[PDB]
Design an enzyme around this catalytic site. Sequence first.
Site, PDB file in Angstrom:
ATOM      1  N   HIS A 198      37.431  41.833  46.040  1.00  0.00           N
ATOM      2  CA  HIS A 198      38.792  41.245  46.118  1.00  0.00           C
ATOM      3  C   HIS A 198      39.852  42.288  45.768  1.00  0.00           C
ATOM      4  CE1 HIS A 198      39.233  40.018  41.696  1.00  0.00           C
ATOM      5  NE2 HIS A 198      37.985  39.709  41.788  1.00  0.00           N
TER       6      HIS A 198
ATOM      7  N   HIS B 167      43.948  46.936  38.080  1.00  0.00           N
ATOM      8  CA  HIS B 167      43.668  46.791  39.505  1.00  0.00           C
ATOM      9  C   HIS B 167      45.037  46.631  40.198  1.00  0.00           C
ATOM     10  CE1 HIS B 167      43.806  42.812  37.856  1.00  0.00           C
ATOM     11  NE2 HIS B 167      44.445  42.615  39.025  1.00  0.00           N
TER      12      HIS B 167
ATOM     13  N   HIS C 219      47.343  44.819  43.659  1.00  0.00           N
ATOM     14  CA  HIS C 219      47.512  43.769  44.694  1.00  0.00           C
ATOM     15  C   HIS C 219      48.405  44.459  45.775  1.00  0.00           C
ATOM     16  CE1 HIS C 219      45.663  40.652  42.356  1.00  0.00           C
ATOM     17  NE2 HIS C 219      46.257  41.260  41.387  1.00  0.00           N
TER      18      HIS C 219
ATOM     19  N   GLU D 146      52.848  40.389  43.791  1.00  0.00           N
ATOM     20  CA  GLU D 146      52.557  38.994  43.447  1.00  0.00           C
ATOM     21  C   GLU D 146      53.856  38.454  42.900  1.00  0.00           C
ATOM     22  OE1 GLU D 146      48.720  38.690  41.313  1.00  0.00           O
ATOM     23  OE2 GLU D 146      48.041  38.074  43.294  1.00  0.00           O
TER      24      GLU D 146
ATOM     25  N   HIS E 291      48.245  45.744  37.919  1.00  0.00           N
ATOM     26  CA  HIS E 291      48.072  44.885  36.708  1.00  0.00           C
ATOM     27  C   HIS E 291      47.159  45.564  35.708  1.00  0.00           C
ATOM     28  CE1 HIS E 291      49.113  40.958  39.257  1.00  0.00           C
ATOM     29  NE2 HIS E 291      50.176  41.619  38.834  1.00  0.00           N
TER      30      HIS E 291
ATOM     31  N   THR F  87      45.789  35.587  38.201  1.00  0.00           N
ATOM     32  CA  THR F  87      46.267  35.281  39.536  1.00  0.00           C
ATOM     33  C   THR F  87      45.145  35.159  40.526  1.00  0.00           C
ATOM     34  OG1 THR F  87      46.940  37.498  40.219  1.00  0.00           O
ATOM     35  CG2 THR F  87      48.700  36.260  39.080  1.00  0.00           C
ATOM     36  N   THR F  88      43.906  35.248  40.033  1.00  0.00           N
ATOM     37  CA  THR F  88      42.734  34.956  40.876  1.00  0.00           C
ATOM     38  C   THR F  88      41.906  33.916  40.075  1.00  0.00           C
ATOM     39  OG1 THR F  88      41.574  36.734  39.762  1.00  0.00           O
ATOM     40  CG2 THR F  88      42.723  37.399  41.818  1.00  0.00           C
TER      41      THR F  88
HETATM   42 CU   LIG Z   1      46.066  40.994  39.198  1.00  0.00          CU
HETATM   43 CU   LIG Z   2      33.875  37.298  43.992  1.00  0.00          CU
END
Ligand SMILES: [Cu+2]
Ligand SMILES: [Cu+2]
Length: 258
Positions: free
Chosen positions: A62, A92, A94, A104, A117, A196-197
């Site tokens: 992701h 990580h 986005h 985001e 982030h 946010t995930t």
């Molecule tokens: Cu994030």
């Molecule tokens: Cu996964």
Amino acid sequence: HHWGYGKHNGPEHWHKDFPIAKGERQSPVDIDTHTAKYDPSLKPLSVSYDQATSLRILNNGHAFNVEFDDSQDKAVLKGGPLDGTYRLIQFHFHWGSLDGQGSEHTVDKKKYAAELHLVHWNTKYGDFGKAVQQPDGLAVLGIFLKVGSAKPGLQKVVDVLDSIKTKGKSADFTNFDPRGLLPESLDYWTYPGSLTTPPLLECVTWIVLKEPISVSSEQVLKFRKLNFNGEGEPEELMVDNWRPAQPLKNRQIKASFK
Ligand SMILES: [Cu+2]
Ligand SMILES: [Cu+2]
């Protein structure tokens, strides 16, 4: 099936498996600059990353995470709206398929090309796993990236992406200094929100810096070259891995500056 960012498993679908998706303290949000309250009681942020120990970079299907040794108080965050010490565990990004989208959080509805982030967990909880179960367990530093000049400090990351192209790949990633990713100014906005995930836990105190960092077009292009898919599966480019802005509901965004 499992969550992602496509038409069939995308953010509009998350609620079916994670009902918390429609919670009262969901992230990201749109930061309305004229409605954010300046709070003079907010102290300056204190970032101590001089002892940072990075270990690895991983494609989890992701995004790509750079992970740090959080076995001791090596890279910490404190001050600002925080009580206690928060240890850096991973960072990580986005990003989007085009330069006009990818962040985001938004500022007055403006979208940036990407958002970094830096995830930290409250040491009072002993480990990350316990910290996500608390309303004050995590602190996330969000930084917007805009396309302009290259960021020297980001090139080491850019360069290893080829080696972690598909879901499940990882690579040794030692001696990376995250101080090379900070803007000059540490002015920020803060509000209580969530991851946010999925699992979308409402355990985060967000700290979003006012000043974006610039990256070159070519640096951002190498991000867009990653895959969501695992090796030997049909190619799905890793792009647009961002969740849209969620209702503010009962929350106030505070500013550390006027
Ligand atoms: Cu994030
Ligand atoms: Cu996964």
